[PDB]
Nucleic acid binder design. Sequence first.
RNA 1: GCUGUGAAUCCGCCGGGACCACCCGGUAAGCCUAAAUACUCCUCGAUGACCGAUAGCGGAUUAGUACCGUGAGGGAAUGGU
RNA 2: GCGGAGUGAUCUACCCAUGGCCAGGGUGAAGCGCGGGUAAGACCGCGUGGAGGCCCGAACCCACUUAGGUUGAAGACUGAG
RNA 3: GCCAGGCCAGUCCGCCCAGGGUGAGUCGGGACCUAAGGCGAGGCCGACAGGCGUAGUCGAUGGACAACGGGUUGAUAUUCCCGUACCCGUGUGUGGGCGAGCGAAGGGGUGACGCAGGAAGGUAGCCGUACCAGUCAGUGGUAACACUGGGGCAAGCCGGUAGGGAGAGCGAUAGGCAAAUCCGUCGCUCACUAAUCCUGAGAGGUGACGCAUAGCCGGUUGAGGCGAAUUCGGUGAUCCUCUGCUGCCAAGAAAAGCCUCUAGCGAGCACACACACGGCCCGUACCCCAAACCGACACAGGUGGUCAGGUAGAGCAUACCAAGGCGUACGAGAUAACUAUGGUUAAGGAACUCGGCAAAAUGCCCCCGUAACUUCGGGAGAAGGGGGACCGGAAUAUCGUGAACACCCUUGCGGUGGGAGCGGGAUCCGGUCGCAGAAACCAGUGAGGAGCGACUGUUUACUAAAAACACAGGUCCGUGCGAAGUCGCAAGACGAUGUAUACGGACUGACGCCUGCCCGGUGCUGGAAGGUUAAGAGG
RNA 4: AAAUUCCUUGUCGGGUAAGUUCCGACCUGCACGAAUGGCGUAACGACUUCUCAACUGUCUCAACCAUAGACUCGGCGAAAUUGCACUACGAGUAAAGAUGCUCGUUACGCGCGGCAGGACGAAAAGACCCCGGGACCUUCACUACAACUUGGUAUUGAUGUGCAUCUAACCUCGAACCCUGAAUCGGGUUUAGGGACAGUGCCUGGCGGGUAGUUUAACUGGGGCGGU
RNA 5: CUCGAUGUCGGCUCGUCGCAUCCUGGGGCUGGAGCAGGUCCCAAGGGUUGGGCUGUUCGCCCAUUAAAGCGGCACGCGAGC
RNA 6: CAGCUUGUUGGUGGGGUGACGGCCUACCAAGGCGACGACGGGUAGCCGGCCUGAGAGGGUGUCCGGCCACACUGGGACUGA
RNA 7: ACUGCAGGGGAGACUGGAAUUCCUGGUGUAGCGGUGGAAUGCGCAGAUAUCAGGAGGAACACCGGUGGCGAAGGCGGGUCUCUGGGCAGUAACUGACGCUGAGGAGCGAAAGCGUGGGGAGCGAACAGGAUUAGAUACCCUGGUAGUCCACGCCGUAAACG
RNA 8: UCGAAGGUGGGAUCGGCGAUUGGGACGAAGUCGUAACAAGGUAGCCGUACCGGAAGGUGCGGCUGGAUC
Lengths: 44, 272
Amino acid sequence: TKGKRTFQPNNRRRARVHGFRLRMRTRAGRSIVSSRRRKGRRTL
Amino acid sequence: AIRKYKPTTPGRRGASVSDFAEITRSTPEKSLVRPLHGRGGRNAHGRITTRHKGGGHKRAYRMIDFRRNDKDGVNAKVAHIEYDPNRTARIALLHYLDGEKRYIIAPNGLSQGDVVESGANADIKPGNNLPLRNIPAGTLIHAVELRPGGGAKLARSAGSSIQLLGKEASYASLRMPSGEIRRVDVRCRATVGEVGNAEQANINWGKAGRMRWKGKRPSVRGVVMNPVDHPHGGGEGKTSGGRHPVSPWGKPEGRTRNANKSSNKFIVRRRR
RNA sequence: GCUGUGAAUCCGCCGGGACCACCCGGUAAGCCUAAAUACUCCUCGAUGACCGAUAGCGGAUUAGUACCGUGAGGGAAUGGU
RNA sequence: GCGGAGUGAUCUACCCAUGGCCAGGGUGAAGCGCGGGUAAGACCGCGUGGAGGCCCGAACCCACUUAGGUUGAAGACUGAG
RNA sequence: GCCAGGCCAGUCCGCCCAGGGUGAGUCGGGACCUAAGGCGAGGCCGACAGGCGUAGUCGAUGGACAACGGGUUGAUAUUCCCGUACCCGUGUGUGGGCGAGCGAAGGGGUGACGCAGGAAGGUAGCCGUACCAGUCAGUGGUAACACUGGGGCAAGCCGGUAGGGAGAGCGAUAGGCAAAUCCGUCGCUCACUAAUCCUGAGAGGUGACGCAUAGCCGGUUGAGGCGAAUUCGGUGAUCCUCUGCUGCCAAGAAAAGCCUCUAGCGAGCACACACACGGCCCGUACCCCAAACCGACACAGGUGGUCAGGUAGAGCAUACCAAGGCGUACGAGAUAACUAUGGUUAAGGAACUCGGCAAAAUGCCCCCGUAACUUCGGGAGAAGGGGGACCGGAAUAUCGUGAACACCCUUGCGGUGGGAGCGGGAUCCGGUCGCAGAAACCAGUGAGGAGCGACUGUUUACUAAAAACACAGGUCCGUGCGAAGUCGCAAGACGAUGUAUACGGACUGACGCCUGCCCGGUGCUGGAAGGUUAAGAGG
RNA sequence: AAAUUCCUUGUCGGGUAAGUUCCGACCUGCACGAAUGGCGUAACGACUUCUCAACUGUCUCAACCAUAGACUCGGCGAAAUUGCACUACGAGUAAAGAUGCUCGUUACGCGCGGCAGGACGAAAAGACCCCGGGACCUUCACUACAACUUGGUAUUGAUGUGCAUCUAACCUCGAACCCUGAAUCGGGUUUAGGGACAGUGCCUGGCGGGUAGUUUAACUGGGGCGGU
RNA sequence: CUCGAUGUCGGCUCGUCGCAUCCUGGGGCUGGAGCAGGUCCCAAGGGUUGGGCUGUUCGCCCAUUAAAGCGGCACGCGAGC
RNA sequence: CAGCUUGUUGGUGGGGUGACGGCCUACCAAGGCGACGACGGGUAGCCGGCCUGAGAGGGUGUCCGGCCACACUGGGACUGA
RNA sequence: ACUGCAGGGGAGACUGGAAUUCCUGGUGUAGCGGUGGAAUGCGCAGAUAUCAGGAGGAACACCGGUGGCGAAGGCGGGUCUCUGGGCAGUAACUGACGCUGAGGAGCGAAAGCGUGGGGAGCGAACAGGAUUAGAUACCCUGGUAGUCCACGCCGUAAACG
RNA sequence: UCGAAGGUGGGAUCGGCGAUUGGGACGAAGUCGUAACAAGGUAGCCGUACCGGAAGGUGCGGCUGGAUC
Ligand SMILES: [Mg+2]
Ligand SMILES: [Mg+2]
Ligand SMILES: [Mg+2]
Ligand SMILES: [Mg+2]
Ligand SMILES: [Mg+2]
Ligand SMILES: [Mg+2]
Ligand SMILES: [Mg+2]
Ligand SMILES: [Mg+2]
Ligand SMILES: [Mg+2]
Ligand SMILES: [Mg+2]
Ligand SMILES: [Mg+2]
Ligand SMILES: [Mg+2]
Ligand SMILES: [Mg+2]
Ligand SMILES: [Mg+2]
Ligand SMILES: [Mg+2]
Ligand SMILES: [Mg+2]
Ligand SMILES: [Mg+2]
Ligand SMILES: [Mg+2]
Ligand SMILES: [Mg+2]
Ligand SMILES: [Mg+2]
Ligand SMILES: [Mg+2]
Ligand SMILES: [Mg+2]
Ligand SMILES: [Mg+2]
Ligand SMILES: [Mg+2]
Ligand SMILES: [Mg+2]
Ligand SMILES: [Mg+2]
Ligand SMILES: [Mg+2]
Ligand SMILES: [Mg+2]
Ligand SMILES: [Mg+2]
Ligand SMILES: [Mg+2]
Ligand SMILES: [Mg+2]
Ligand SMILES: [Mg+2]
Ligand SMILES: [Mg+2]
Ligand SMILES: [Mg+2]
Ligand SMILES: [Mg+2]
Ligand SMILES: [Mg+2]
Ligand SMILES: [Mg+2]
Ligand SMILES: [Mg+2]
Ligand SMILES: [Mg+2]
Ligand SMILES: [Mg+2]
Ligand SMILES: [Mg+2]
Ligand SMILES: [Mg+2]
Ligand SMILES: [Mg+2]
Ligand SMILES: [Mg+2]
Ligand SMILES: [Mg+2]
Ligand SMILES: [Mg+2]
Ligand SMILES: [Mg+2]
Ligand SMILES: [Mg+2]
Ligand SMILES: [Mg+2]
Ligand SMILES: [Mg+2]
Ligand SMILES: [Mg+2]
Ligand SMILES: [Mg+2]
Ligand SMILES: [Mg+2]
Ligand SMILES: [Mg+2]
Ligand SMILES: [Mg+2]
Ligand SMILES: [Mg+2]
Ligand SMILES: [Mg+2]
Ligand SMILES: [Mg+2]
Ligand SMILES: [Mg+2]
Ligand SMILES: [Mg+2]
Ligand SMILES: [Mg+2]
Ligand SMILES: [Mg+2]
Ligand SMILES: [Mg+2]
Ligand SMILES: [Mg+2]
Ligand SMILES: [Mg+2]
Ligand SMILES: [Mg+2]
Ligand SMILES: [Mg+2]
Ligand SMILES: [Mg+2]
Ligand SMILES: [Mg+2]
Ligand SMILES: [Mg+2]
Ligand SMILES: [Mg+2]
Ligand SMILES: [Mg+2]
Ligand SMILES: [Mg+2]
Ligand SMILES: [Mg+2]
Ligand SMILES: [Mg+2]
Ligand SMILES: [Mg+2]
Ligand SMILES: [Mg+2]
Ligand SMILES: [Mg+2]
Ligand SMILES: [Mg+2]
Ligand SMILES: [Mg+2]
Ligand SMILES: [Mg+2]
Ligand SMILES: [Mg+2]
Ligand SMILES: [Mg+2]
Ligand SMILES: [Mg+2]
Ligand SMILES: [Mg+2]
Ligand SMILES: [Mg+2]
Ligand SMILES: [Mg+2]
Ligand SMILES: [Mg+2]
Ligand SMILES: [Mg+2]
Ligand SMILES: [Mg+2]
Ligand SMILES: [Mg+2]
Ligand SMILES: [Mg+2]
Ligand SMILES: [Mg+2]
Ligand SMILES: [Mg+2]
Ligand SMILES: [Mg+2]
Ligand SMILES: [Mg+2]
Ligand SMILES: [Mg+2]
Ligand SMILES: [Mg+2]
Ligand SMILES: [Mg+2]
Ligand SMILES: [Mg+2]
Ligand SMILES: [Mg+2]
Ligand SMILES: [Mg+2]
Ligand SMILES: [Mg+2]
Ligand SMILES: [Mg+2]
Ligand SMILES: [Mg+2]
Ligand SMILES: [Mg+2]
Ligand SMILES: [Mg+2]
Ligand SMILES: [Mg+2]
Ligand SMILES: [Mg+2]
Ligand SMILES: [Mg+2]
Ligand SMILES: [Mg+2]
Ligand SMILES: [Mg+2]
Ligand SMILES: [Mg+2]
Ligand SMILES: [Mg+2]
Ligand SMILES: [Mg+2]
Ligand SMILES: [Mg+2]
Ligand SMILES: [Mg+2]
Ligand SMILES: [Mg+2]
Ligand SMILES: [Mg+2]
Ligand SMILES: [Mg+2]
Ligand SMILES: [Mg+2]
Ligand SMILES: [Mg+2]
Ligand SMILES: [Mg+2]
Ligand SMILES: [Mg+2]
Ligand SMILES: [Mg+2]
Ligand SMILES: [Mg+2]
Ligand SMILES: [Mg+2]
Ligand SMILES: [Mg+2]
Ligand SMILES: [Mg+2]
Ligand SMILES: [Mg+2]
Ligand SMILES: [Mg+2]
Ligand SMILES: [Mg+2]
Ligand SMILES: [Mg+2]
Ligand SMILES: [Mg+2]
Ligand SMILES: [Mg+2]
Ligand SMILES: [Mg+2]
Ligand SMILES: [Mg+2]
Ligand SMILES: [Mg+2]
Ligand SMILES: [Mg+2]
Ligand SMILES: [Mg+2]
Ligand SMILES: [Mg+2]
């Protein structure tokens, strides 16, 4: 673990862990998406 | 039947291994094998519910016939005696004369090439599966079912056996290798004989890594834990646990059988 | 409200602050019912002993933007010939 | 610090499935052959064999010591072992 | 382009601006398959929220699946072009053949699998070499085969080598949910000591009358055009035969695909050749031990996989080099102290210091030799010693490796001898040189006595690596089986597709000799004579 | 005499010129002891500890050399810090350690390279200690709760003499069949068992650091302990 | 005084100061014959060792020495180790 | 004291000796000794004799005489029969 | 060699009954047990006793002897399987092949040791009771190893005639 | 080249001393028991095991170098 930082990017895992469909699969996720629309975030 | 490695290395000093002298055909029968994946002691929730499991060699499941219900009267030939990673007993590949391929637990004295009968008319030989009605009292049996047609569940590890104690009206009383006397229905079926490979309990695994191969993961004593992790945890030097011994969940040692379990009527005398 | 027990149909049943008698009141265990009440994302029309660019909305300006965070989230600055 | 509701195992801990990787030397287990030994064996000597959480040692994975760094080249590294 | 950025400057740039640039039936993915896992019709469970899960459907890191060589652009190329292939599908003709043929529900087989270790046959690569082409370096020598360069080419297709793989039929059939001619099981005849069939590394042919190449003529030194020789050896893989063989125990995915069976479909079919066509979607530029990724930076860190030549070397170490890159982004000076990193040091040699911390030392190969103790394996590379370079001879067959011209025999990638050249290793004898022969780089200090922990391992990412943890072994307790235990309100799950030689918990911690006394306290186990007591009943 | 021994460097022996460490013993064990194992133990250890050989700049006791800095020049160009400022020293004095006050003394103004005594230098609203708050941990602190467990009652019935039997409630992760085309789910049907038991609801006793919220005084020549 | 920090022992390095002097220097008295001492007075210029044990200070010991002094300076000195 | 022996056992060709001889050497084979005591450890000069004893034996090896070995300790040649 | 003969000679498997102990139930009540005398202890929660059933282990009464067999140690419930020796007779055979035996090898009661089973009764240790001046004993009450089994080790006995 | 002596090294082997510790023998009119000899007060011995201040005790097998009928 010497030298290895916390964020190792991988777009597929990003999408499968934080993606829109993941959000929409639970009420908490839909609540988050609607909260970000309500705040007006460009990225949802 | 147990072969001891020489002390050529500290991991093999006192170690021993089965000589596998009973095994023929070191490969399993393909049509009779189904996949099997480790669980690491994790249940459906993804959480560790049995500690100390994980790693261990990849394994394949062979289908053992713990039923032996549908081939009464059709004879079988012990085609092979073979290793099975999934149990401590060896397994016997039987070719039924009707062409069906089967695995059974290998009893003492079922060398390759001899005949296994099933049903009420079977001879009382090791490997023959009969109802307890037709099995006489006093003989050593194994792979005996608790309920009629429910499949073998009793005495099926290496060297284990029930002896039939008696049959009074419709229940066979029998001594379970824990020493416990239990009654089961007489139409529960059992296969005659001790389970083979009775000497595998004498294997001395030499090293930690070998149990890691068999899938056991290191166990940490509660007394070297912190109090947050275990009731025995805490203390400045080493302690005995500052209390009567309990599980990691605070449960005191003691009987854990349901005192009002429905099977008490059939349990005649609990183990000693 | 749940559990158990469990009625009676007016010469019944309920309430009147334990309870009883008298007296008074009312008809549970079906439903529906406007108005007076609450609120303002939004649309017009006005207003202010309100602010006036470090104020007033976070946002007069790329503003929920840039940027930060894996993520939930956080979140600016910048007006005047 | 307390609570409610959410976000996180792209770091790390463990596990699961599926892949990959481990220069080069050394030692010489079982087993298997031949011979001796006796009646037969034990057993022994030679070969063969290539075992082992085996040895030395790169990659790789670590991080024992030490010096340096210590407003660093670096919010944990570098040099030498 | 140069006012920001780049640790300076900058005409340069991964910066700024504009335009351009990424071409696939075969590559990597999808349209194919499934693993773990995810979601999950209905469903079960749960006040609600929701949990779990069947069918199913996703999900590569795996399975299946058809392309190679060369050329070309400023920027793409297994994609474009050339040459030559292969795969799937479609249509149209011709020829003759069968009136079989297709079977993809399902069945069955295969797919289909671990680790370790070679050996043998090979090949790539590499080193020489026949041969080919260029050069004459004004220094002492050196005019030729001295020196330098070349001494090449795939997929595919054909033939089929070594080595491997197989008994062949006939009959019955209680099993494979129905069926089966398939598979499984059983039975019988022939031969076996044999032939036959399949697969088949390498090699050969073809691909290739092509491509490429050393080099040569003229040449805004662009672009052209021409273009030799290419043989025989040695060595030799991390690659192929090999999904093999052997050994081992810890016993090593699935599904599709393919084959086959029948269920079923079926009046039309299969097959050949020729021609003409259709082959979709996504990625493809550029960066990748990085200045373009993760580290706020053009950051001494981190980043999985592939290739990886020569000489010396055991080696992917190391030293110097090749191909190929690079001098990487502040410089120029200057013998201050001092700091850092290295180096050397008289005499002494641990007197230093908490402590030999650091350094020094040892270090390689071969041959001798090696103690207490031991669990008989070890200890051990114990310790302690010796030899080591070059040249010559032994030496034409010294020896061992690989095996050519020309002679003999069942006609072959065949066999017997035969030994050329080419490499390898070891010894002995003689000589020669230096201070020194392990030559540089590289590269164990050793011994003795205690304590603790048996051991390999693990641990406080970022001050603790230990005597701590784990461990094999031990014992006790629990658990008779949708067990006990655990996660969940439950359903359900793990335990375990396990069944007391098993599983869980506890303590101990290899092994040897052992493990004494106490059941008063507190637990746990069992018992129920009596006392006490809740709700309920009673009243 | 120990990873345990306070006294203690116990005593004796060995090792050294000299040994609070080391080894072997003694036993007077403050306060060893048998699976929180006892005593040993080959092998093993980047463990701790003691000794020896070799080796050396560790040292006697340093010297010299090269390089990267330091230094100079040119370019770019930060930082922590900062109430001030033409910021001496002595002996004093003072919130008891003075650049800044007293009395003396010393000192031309300004740079550059160095050193590190002071500026109670810088850095982090001291981790120690106490006081207040918190957190987590423990338990025979308190009070609860989960879990486990008890009985009553409902689900819950029949027949005989609480007991026994029965079966029809209910239960079955026993079996077969159907929804089902694909199903180790589910449901239904049948069967084989169990059976008014179990489980569950309500009521109820027990148990309950498993969990939770909390409390756990003050005075005190610091706090604790003691005392009050 | 200092808790919005005054780094704690020992060692090393560098010192500096006092004298209550260990040596060297000068003296008085002596139970000073001499050699040596004892004691007191004056005297701070210089000197005042290297090792073993211990973290040590201290102390004991070894071998020396003319002697192996005692104290202060934040028990001097960690922006010096 | 159970394994001792590599010029050790033998042969050939040589050398060397006064002389045979592993006495030595080059090469070749792998033999020789030993439980009847090899190898080793301890002790010791040996003998005709002397002492004793009935003898066998036991003790002993002094005078004499014979043999051997040595000449401070250890190693080597020379002359000369 | 052949014919006969006697035998607890050995090994393996299966198997029989008495008795002891324990469990389940029936009866039944206040003792049982034990000693020189007691007590510890067991029981009143139903002991001892008695009946029936069952589990298990060990040893095999009567035969049984003064006997038989075996080299010795040792060996007996029964059956079966395998197997050793001995004795007699014939004189068929060989024709001294014999005896002993340093060393050596094997066998070798019991105890003990290792691993794994088993464990009724007995019973080192241990504990309590008693006795006693004490009682680490003898006696009593319990009782672990062991005694049993398999396989190794041990290699010793008043292994004695 | 061989070579005595010498040097280096690791072993072998024979001795001495050694804190501490173990038994043996002989001594004295000491202390604790009474184990054996009689049935020695529990017959004694053998092997073995365990236990105990000490003789000894006990278990298992054996013997008579003891008893009983
Ligand atoms: Mg989930
Ligand atoms: Mg476990
Ligand atoms: Mg801890
Ligand atoms: Mg935790
Ligand atoms: Mg706790
Ligand atoms: Mg602790
Ligand atoms: Mg403690
Ligand atoms: Mg009404
Ligand atoms: Mg109404
Ligand atoms: Mg309404
Ligand atoms: Mg209204
Ligand atoms: Mg309005
Ligand atoms: Mg408006
Ligand atoms: Mg604003
Ligand atoms: Mg982002
Ligand atoms: Mg919170
Ligand atoms: Mg999450
Ligand atoms: Mg991960
Ligand atoms: Mg993840
Ligand atoms: Mg190797
Ligand atoms: Mg071998
Ligand atoms: Mg290793
Ligand atoms: Mg690599
Ligand atoms: Mg890596
Ligand atoms: Mg780590
Ligand atoms: Mg450091
Ligand atoms: Mg390094
Ligand atoms: Mg510029
Ligand atoms: Mg610039
Ligand atoms: Mg749904
Ligand atoms: Mg789901
Ligand atoms: Mg799925
Ligand atoms: Mg997919
Ligand atoms: Mg993939
Ligand atoms: Mg390019
Ligand atoms: Mg083409
Ligand atoms: Mg498989
Ligand atoms: Mg090869
Ligand atoms: Mg010239
Ligand atoms: Mg050339
Ligand atoms: Mg067939
Ligand atoms: Mg070819
Ligand atoms: Mg080649
Ligand atoms: Mg590209
Ligand atoms: Mg970057
Ligand atoms: Mg850079
Ligand atoms: Mg970088
Ligand atoms: Mg390198
Ligand atoms: Mg410079
Ligand atoms: Mg020097
Ligand atoms: Mg020198
Ligand atoms: Mg020296
Ligand atoms: Mg020293
Ligand atoms: Mg030394
Ligand atoms: Mg010193
Ligand atoms: Mg060091
Ligand atoms: Mg060094
Ligand atoms: Mg050693
Ligand atoms: Mg060596
Ligand atoms: Mg040579
Ligand atoms: Mg020579
Ligand atoms: Mg010379
Ligand atoms: Mg360790
Ligand atoms: Mg190792
Ligand atoms: Mg750390
Ligand atoms: Mg560390
Ligand atoms: Mg364990
Ligand atoms: Mg158990
Ligand atoms: Mg459960
Ligand atoms: Mg326990
Ligand atoms: Mg432990
Ligand atoms: Mg104990
Ligand atoms: Mg009690
Ligand atoms: Mg110590
Ligand atoms: Mg001491
Ligand atoms: Mg000591
Ligand atoms: Mg204990
Ligand atoms: Mg321990
Ligand atoms: Mg380690
Ligand atoms: Mg310099
Ligand atoms: Mg400058
Ligand atoms: Mg001044
Ligand atoms: Mg002052
Ligand atoms: Mg002043
Ligand atoms: Mg002033
Ligand atoms: Mg200055
Ligand atoms: Mg300071
Ligand atoms: Mg400060
Ligand atoms: Mg503060
Ligand atoms: Mg409690
Ligand atoms: Mg209940
Ligand atoms: Mg209830
Ligand atoms: Mg609490
Ligand atoms: Mg509160
Ligand atoms: Mg107070
Ligand atoms: Mg006080
Ligand atoms: Mg301050
Ligand atoms: Mg004075
Ligand atoms: Mg005087
Ligand atoms: Mg002085
Ligand atoms: Mg002067
Ligand atoms: Mg020393
Ligand atoms: Mg001083
Ligand atoms: Mg100080
Ligand atoms: Mg001081
Ligand atoms: Mg200091
Ligand atoms: Mg300071
Ligand atoms: Mg010779
Ligand atoms: Mg000769
Ligand atoms: Mg001669
Ligand atoms: Mg003599
Ligand atoms: Mg006489
Ligand atoms: Mg003489
Ligand atoms: Mg004389
Ligand atoms: Mg003399
Ligand atoms: Mg002469
Ligand atoms: Mg017999
Ligand atoms: Mg009986
Ligand atoms: Mg019992
Ligand atoms: Mg009874
Ligand atoms: Mg009875
Ligand atoms: Mg004759
Ligand atoms: Mg003998
Ligand atoms: Mg024997
Ligand atoms: Mg015995
Ligand atoms: Mg035993
Ligand atoms: Mg024992
Ligand atoms: Mg046992
Ligand atoms: Mg007794
Ligand atoms: Mg007693
Ligand atoms: Mg037996
Ligand atoms: Mg004897
Ligand atoms: Mg006898
Ligand atoms: Mg002595
Ligand atoms: Mg007596
Ligand atoms: Mg006696
Ligand atoms: Mg007596
Ligand atoms: Mg007696
Ligand atoms: Mg005895
Ligand atoms: Mg006793
Ligand atoms: Mg006896």
